[PDB]
Each structure stands twice: as structure tokens, then as C-alpha cells.
A and B are shown apart, each in its own frame.
With several copies, the nearest count.
Chain A
């Protein structure tokens, strides 16, 4: 039957949080392009390795339906990571502090939300995600570029997540 280890109300709220955050990052990316003509993340590609911008994988999602402890676990680690990267940007600058703060609270709660659900259903690993290695962002420019990059990665991460979740919503 259309059984699933995850409630549907929860999955729909996750999909809504994904869209909300996707709209927050878009605002951030718009601001950075308007305020600092930093508009194409591709141009900044190489600074990801240089700055150490972590990547959050989702290897465990297109291959499971009634057994998904690993999938939620990754979704969480990822959101948790970007929650840290956005914090590391120390607000980027006064002009961007507000826009970025919205993005970071929204990402933090989505991550929290996912954790508490995992606990409720009995999935929460004893091991809390050892917060990923956080980047430096030593100058104004590093923070501005870092922002464009982090936003770009968050974006890619959420597009995949959206597909994974959209799928689970109809089992």
C-alpha cells in the first residue's frame, strides 16, 4: 500500500520550508548582485576549494522508501552545515545582515524541525552531527564571495532535496 515511515503532514511542511528558504537565498543572491555586482557564482567557482567551502552530499535518497533514517539524517547534516557556513559569514556587511539573518534562521529551524521529527519517530542518532569544519572568510571580499558561493551551494542542495521530498510525498 502507499505506506511510508514518514507522516504526510511532516513531508508537506518540509517541502514548504524548502521553498521558503529557496526564496530567502534568492533574495540574498539578488542583494549581493545588486549591492556588489557579484552576480555569477560560476565566476567564483575556484574559491570554494581555496576557502574550503564544504559540500553536503545526498547519496542516500533516490534509493529507499520505508527505510529512510539515512536520508533524513543527511538532509539534516546538510542543513546543519549551511547553517554554520552562513553563520561564519559574520553577516557579510550591514547592508546584508538582515537578508542573510532571515536566510540563516530559516535554515536553522528547518534543520531543527527535521531533527525533532527524527527523534519523535525514533531515528535520531546518538551522534549529533559533529559540526563541519568552518571556513575563514578573512576579508570583505572573502565574505561577499563566500556568500555568493554558500548561497549557490545551498540552492543546489535544496533543488535535490525538493525532488527527494516531492517523491516521498507520494508513495
Chain B
């Protein structure tokens, strides 16, 4: 059949690098006719019941099944209704409306963890991903002696940055792997990915 069906798994992430809300969806059945997807939206208030100012439609590029709303069109720190509409020569379909505040779906990148510049000790230092430095963050640091049995040891609720952080109790292997990830403190947000593994050597 050819009627476009209601799209799904619609998600949006606020990209601080490009300062734009990026939304991606699942079209489904590969129709054999000239179809088109338009990311539609309007400013609203919490719970998205107040049909506010219409935000310019974002027409998806030809192959790509995603569109980006430039920040010049968003009102940060206020809710908005977003949905995608499929227009085909034989019908239309819409996705259920999503209700978010772009700042609640900010895509974070891992913090800058480094060995700083005592027996069985290590000194660390970390600063957050600069574009998000304005965000109060909380981080987890995970460490393990690099051995055949991958057992992760955690430190929770660490600050977004530390000039020098002395970690000790590291004598179970000559070298340890360390990673750190962060998340927005006290407000909605997703964890960042774990930073690339740091392989450091504990002072002998």
C-alpha cells in the first residue's frame, strides 16, 4: 500500500556546538512515491496545552530523516510542542506530539580528564566540555586496574571540575584505565558518553 503511516521514535537533542535542536524520526515503510517530511512546531507552555506561536516548519533534506531547528527560532527555557508530518500524494500522517524544553535535552560531551601537571597514588584534573561550562554538572569517575577481569570501581557525585584530585588505593596492577562522564545537576538531562579511556600509571 502507499498511504504514509504515522512516524515514530521521535527524539530531539539540543546541540550546543551548532546551537540547534536536532530531531530525528522513523518513517517506516519505504513508499514508492514522492513523499516529504516536515518537522512542525509551536511555542507553548508546560504540558503543551496552549497553542502558541508557530515555529517555522523545518523541511527535511531529501535522504536524511532528521531536521534541525536553529536557535534563532527557539525560546529556550520554555516548553514547545514538536511533531513531524508526512505528506504523500495519497494521504498524510503525523507523529504524536512531543513536549520538551530544548535545554532539557542538551547533548553533552564528556569532560576533559587528565593526569595532573605518593606510593600507589594518582593525581587527576578535569574541566568540563567548554560549550556546556555554564551548566552546573555532577560527574562519575570510573577506574579499574587493567587486568583480565574487568571490574569497575566508582566514585560518585564529583564536581564538574577539579584542579587536583588525589586518588589512591591503586595497587592491583601497574596501570589503570580511567573514564569520567557528566550530567546536568538537579535538572533534566541525559548522561554524557564516558570520556575516552585514560591509561595512567600509579606512582610506585
Contact = CB atoms under 8 A, between A and B. Distances in A.
Direct contact of A and B (CB under 8 A): yes
Interface of A: 1-9, 12-13, 15-17, 19-20, 22-23, 66-67, 101-102, 105-106, 109-110, 112-113, 116, 120-122, 171
B155 A66 contact: yes
Contacts of A2: 157-159
B162 interface: yes
B134 A1 contact: no
Given A13-B187, A16-B135, A101 B72 contact: yes
Interface residues of B, number: 29
A3 B186 contact: no
A23 B134 contact: yes
Q: For chain A, what secondary structure do more than half of its interface residues adopt (helix, strand, loop), or is it mixed?
A: helix
A96 to B, nearest CB: 16
Contacts of B165: 1
Interface of B: 19, 45, 71-72, 75-78, 101, 103, 133-136, 151-159, 162, 165, 169, 185-187
Nearest to A1: B159
Which of A9, A12, A16 has the most CB atoms of chain B within a 10 A radius of its CB?
A16
Nearest to A23: B134
A15 B154 contact: no
A19 B159 contact: no
